[PDB]
């Protein structure tokens with residue numbers, strides 16, 4: 001697993017419907033990343049040449065509200081089942 005800087009516009013976020021993000025943690029992470037940068041890269045799954053992200057909601061929102069183009073990611077080659085497992089009620 002190689003850490004890659006992926007643009008924010010390429011990570012599909014299917015769980016944005018459940019975006020109960022506390023702006024306090026978001027702003028704390030914004031300040032910390034603006035200080036020392038992102039330390040824990042988010043988890044991204046590649047399926048059929050498309051990137052999906054289910055964790056790292058606060059970090060993603062912080063990168064968005066900080067005006068940063070890319071974010072560090074640890075990409076895992078995934079299948080249709082691990083993509084379907086995350087999309088199961």
Ligand SMILES: Nc1ncnc2c1ncn2[C@@H]1O[C@H](COP(=O)(O)OP(=O)(O)O)[C@@H](O)[C@H]1O
Nearest residue numbers: 029032033036037038039040055056057058059
């Ligand atoms: N530069 C950073 N400053 C502060 N926290 C960071 C940084 N990089 C990664 N993190 C991680 O962000 C997490 C805190 O946000 P959290 O809400 O848990 O993340 P998520 O976005 O997955 O919900 C911690 O697990 C922390 O290790």
